[PDB]
Amino acid sequence: MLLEAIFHEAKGSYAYPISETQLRVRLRAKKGDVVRCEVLYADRYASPEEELAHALAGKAGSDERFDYFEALLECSTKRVKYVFLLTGPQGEAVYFGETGFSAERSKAGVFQYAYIHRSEVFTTPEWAKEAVIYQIFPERFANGDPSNDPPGTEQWAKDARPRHDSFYGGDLKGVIDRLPYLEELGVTALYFTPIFASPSHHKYDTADYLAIDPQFGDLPTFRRLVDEAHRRGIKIILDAVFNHAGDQFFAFRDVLQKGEQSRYKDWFFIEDFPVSKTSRTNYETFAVQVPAMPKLRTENPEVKEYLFDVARFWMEQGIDGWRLNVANEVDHAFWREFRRLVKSLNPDALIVGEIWHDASGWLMGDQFDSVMNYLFRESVIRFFATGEIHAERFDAELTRARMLYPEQAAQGLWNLLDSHDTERFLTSCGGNEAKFRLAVLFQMTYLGTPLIYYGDEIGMAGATDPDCRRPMIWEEKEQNRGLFEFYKELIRLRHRLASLTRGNVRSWHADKQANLYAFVRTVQDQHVGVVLNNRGEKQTVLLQVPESGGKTWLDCLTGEEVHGKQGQLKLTLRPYQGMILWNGR
Ligand SMILES: OC[C@H]1O[C@H](OC[C@H]2O[C@H](O[C@H]3[C@H](O)[C@@H](O)[C@@H](O[C@H]4[C@H](O)[C@@H](O)[C@@H](O[C@H]5[C@H](O)[C@@H](O)[C@@H](O)O[C@@H]5CO)O[C@@H]4CO[C@H]4O[C@H](CO)[C@@H](O)[C@H](O)[C@H]4O)O[C@@H]3CO)[C@H](O)[C@@H](O)[C@@H]2O)[C@H](O)[C@@H](O)[C@@H]1O
Ligand SMILES: [Ca+2]
């Protein structure tokens, strides 16, 4: 076996506790190199003559080039030292510990997870595990109050083509009026983009953190929205823009007026007063040269305190969590303290960071509960929309991404198809509803938390920002109701099958040729197999089905009963058809 490809570390995503006395450990090796991975462990202060505990690590998955082995160590002492025993296809074996590799156990040394502190057990809100989030971009969802529309508001139509500066009049009253629609859809939480006072249509350039934007409503209206959503089983998640403020933020206004004399100059990153010759801003902003968004010095204890007060204030209004804007650009300490603040105020308040790349550094348990899973989106785009990758590659990307973070984070990752910053998924699919639906079937059944971008459920399309922010289509005749019912059915199923919300995931079948992909969600004895025929042709496949897991399944989408013969299951799928096979347990 290639030792150069074997890896483990007693931290991060390769070793972390799932309870005060249980440690999950993982190990990767070149794919196919290891057939058996066992862990020999004991208390860190155990005498050398003491017997060692054994734990067999099962193969939790395989990506492009590695196999991932996973085991659970029972550590009643909460302190553990361990070594791996790896066996190859031909029986060759080697011990692997902190010191290195050796045929002699003691020479391999031992990895050590010093101590398991209860406070360090990554814990997320239970509800977040089985939730289906719906993203609402307020200026474009529903205009329930035409009297607060910004000046220049354009007419609400299906052929509307917005510009970066357009306004359509969407507001919070509109959201309230449409709660029956969201409730019928079955969503259990709403993620709102910024709703605080701001002169723009997107509101990411904050004028006042303590006020609902006038064109969206007021405090009383927001509170009514929170209460009405809650009674309909719908939670509220607000967008926290803590990386940067708007040029109209009171502290910045003071800087523009008093220059180096303002008491708030250190709340920002300023280079040379006068505060501005704007084309070449003399203060750091979000991205490049964006005068409206001066970056906040969150490292400044004063800035932090102010923002923490803002969070406290809104949480006092009954919200259920936060989506953190450009979260990877404010400091880690700020986030560790934020989590402590948030969880101390509401143990069930959800913290979701907005990071598009590998966010493992923020997902170890001391900061965010989850992140907007843009890498999940990349795989889905690649496999279902563009067809850049085949089923086996798709399987590998999914598995590799899943192994990047501890299971607690993976379990609640926000799996979106698109957002207000991308083109709509339908468009990515080139208008092919068949491709779109199979992707949605995957979104609704894969491991993680589904996030729906407003309008996708009724067939809206659009290029990226600002075209992805077209006013919501409310005319029934203009809505794709067939799609709407499809979403409704998938959402009801997700709520009915515990496997889909609290189960693990294992690849079932992956054939690069037929481009058919299948996985199994498991919890207890329940198994739900999802089969995806991502091809424009009718195909038949043979899936392996050991009788120990059942020999009869019910396709929950059609009611058809399928049966396995001698450990094999023959399925025939129409083009782009997906099946959700429940094993009746
Ligand atoms: O620039 C002139 C413009 O300035 C103001 O408006 C700016 C911008 O403000 C708003 O954008 C917000 C998003 O809506 C949020 O979701 C979020 O998105 C950021 C994200 O947090 C960043 O990490 C980054 O994303 C990168 C990603 O990190 C990277 O891995 C890779 O995937 O590329 C991503 C970019 O696609 O940028 C996101 C914003 O993207 C947009 O802005 C970029 C900067 O110019 C641009 O390159 C990109 O094409 C855009 O899609 O955080 C931002 C917070 O600002 C608002 O919704 C946007 O519509 C606005 O453009 C003024 O208000 C505006 O009048 C003026 O025209
Ligand atoms: Ca309005």
Helix H, strand E, coil C: the string for 448-461 is CEEEEECCHHHCCC
Number of Cβ within 10 Å of residue 195's Cβ equals 23
Pairing of strands 370-371, 350-353: parallel
Give the C-alpha separation, 357 to 274, whole Å: 36
Gap sites in the chain (C to N > 2.5 Å), preceding residue numbers = none
Token code pair at residue 509: 């079948």
Backbone angles phi, psi at 500, to 5 degrees: -70, -20
Residue 131, CA distances (Å) to 135, 359, 575 in order: 13, 21, 30
Ligand with an atom nearest the CA of residue 191: 1
At the second CATH level, the architecture of 503-585 is Sandwich (2.60)
Experimental technique, in short, is: X-ray
**Residue 81 pairs with which residues in a beta bridge?**
42, 112
Alpha carbon distance, N-terminus to C-terminus of the chain: 40
Question: HSE (CB half, 13 Å, CA atoms) of 461?
Answer: 12
* DSSP track, 330-353: S-HHHHHHHHHHHHHH-TT-EEEE
CA-proximal residue: ligand 1, atom 47 (nearest): 287
Residue 53, CA distances (Å) to 76, 98, 117, 148 in order: 12, 18, 21, 68
Residue 508, CA distances (Å) to 516, 531, 574, 581, 585 in order: 10, 9, 19, 12, 18
Give the C-alpha separation, 59 to 81, whole Å: 22
Q: Can 1-121 and 503-585 be said to share one CATH topology?
A: yes
Contact (CB, 8 A) for 189 and 162? no
Give the C-alpha separation, 561 to 198, whole Å: 55
Contact (CB, 8 A) for 549 and 527? yes
Q: Determine the atom of ligand 1 nearest the C-alpha atom of 326.
A: 21
Q: Which residue has the tokens 């932090």?
A: 304
Give the C-alpha separation, 276 to 290, whole Å: 12
Q: Determine the atom of ligand 1 nearest the C-alpha atom of 289.
A: 1
**CA of 146 relative to ligand 2 center, distance in Å:** 4
Q: Determine the atom of ligand 1 nearest the C-alpha atom of 200.
A: 63
| CA-based nearest residue to 234, from 140, 322, 126, 133 | 133
- Resolution of the solved structure (Å): 2.2
Residues 6+ apart with CB under 8 A from 48: none
Q: Determine the atom of ligand 1 nearest the C-alpha atom of 420.
A: 14
Categorise residue 132: left if φ over 0, alpha if ψ from -120 to 50, beta otherwise: beta
Q: Determine the atom of ligand 1 nearest the C-alpha atom of 421.
A: 51
Cα Rg for the chain, rounded, in angstroms? 26
Report the SS3 class of residue 34. coil
Segment holding 226, helix H or strand E:
helix 219-231
Give the C-alpha separation, 162 to 478, whole Å: 19
- Identify which of 202, 247, 284, 357 to mutate to test ligand 1's pocket (most ligand atoms within 8 A of the CB): 202
**CA of 166 relative to ligand 2 center, distance in Å:** 13
| CA-based nearest residue to 294, from 328, 257, 248, 247 | 247
**CA of 212 relative to ligand 2 center, distance in Å:** 13
Number of helical (H) and strand (E) elements in the chain, helices listed first: 15, 27
CA-proximal residue: ligand 1, atom 48 (nearest): 421
Give the C-alpha separation, 125 to 342, whole Å: 12
Question: HSE (CB half, 13 Å, CA atoms) of 204?
Answer: 20
Helix, strand, coil percentages (3-state) for the chain, rounded to 5, are 30, 25, 45
Give the C-alpha separation, 449 to 444, whole Å: 8
Categorise residue 584: left if φ over 0, alpha if ψ from -120 to 50, beta otherwise: left
Ligand with an atom nearest the CA of residue 214: 2
Contact (CB, 8 A) for 140 and 469? yes
Give the C-alpha separation, 143 to 156, whole Å: 9
* Angle, CA 390 vertex, CA 465 and CA 360 arms, to 5°: 60
Strands (E), 436-573: 449-453, 504-511, 516-523, 526-533, 539-544, 552-555, 561-563, 568-573
Contact (CB, 8 A) for 29 and 1? yes
Give the C-alpha separation, 393 to 65, whole Å: 10
Give the C-alpha separation, 419 to 374, whole Å: 10
Residue 157, CA distances (Å) to 174, 317, 433, 474, 507 in order: 16, 34, 22, 9, 44
Give the C-alpha separation, 345 to 318, whole Å: 11
Contact (CB, 8 A) for 171 and 217? yes
Contact (CB, 8 A) for 34 and 57? no
Q: Determine the atom of ligand 1 nearest the C-alpha atom of 422.
A: 51
User: Per CATH, which fold does 122-242+298-502 belong to?
Assistant: TIM Barrel (3.20.20)
The domain ranges of the chain are 1-121, 122-242+298-502, 243-297, 503-585
Residues 6+ apart with CB under 8 A from 278: 291
Ligand with an atom nearest the CA of residue 141: 2
Token code pair at residue 279: 């084309």
| Domain 243-297 class, CATH top level | alpha beta
Give the C-alpha separation, 220 to 59, whole Å: 54
Three-state helix/strand/coil letters over 113-136:
ECCCCHHHCCCCCHHHHCCCEEEE
Give the C-alpha separation, 279 to 119, whole Å: 49
**CA of 476 relative to ligand 2 center, distance in Å:** 21
Residues 6+ apart with CB under 8 A from 47: none
Burial of 226 (0-12, 13-18, 19+ CB in 10 A): buried
Find how far residue 164's CA is from the centre of its chain. Answer: 27
| CA-based nearest residue to 75, from 39, 107, 115 | 115
What residues flank ion ligand 2 with Cβ within 5 A?
143, 145, 148-149, 169, 171
Residues 6+ apart with CB under 8 A from 164: 465, 466
Give the C-alpha separation, 67 to 62, whole Å: 4
CA-proximal residue: ligand 1, atom 41 (nearest): 421
Give the C-alpha separation, 188 to 132, whole Å: 5
Pocket of ligand 1 (CB under 6 A): 164, 200, 202, 204-205, 286-287, 290, 292-293, 325-326, 354, 356-357, 420-421, 465
Give the C-alpha separation, 540 to 538, whole Å: 7
Query: What's the CATH number for 1-121?
Result: 2.60.40.10
Give the C-alpha separation, 411 to 365, whole Å: 13
Find how far residue 204's CA is from the centre of its chain. Answer: 21
Token code pair at residue 177: 């009026």
DSSP letter, residue 385? I
Give the C-alpha separation, 74 to 55, whole Å: 9
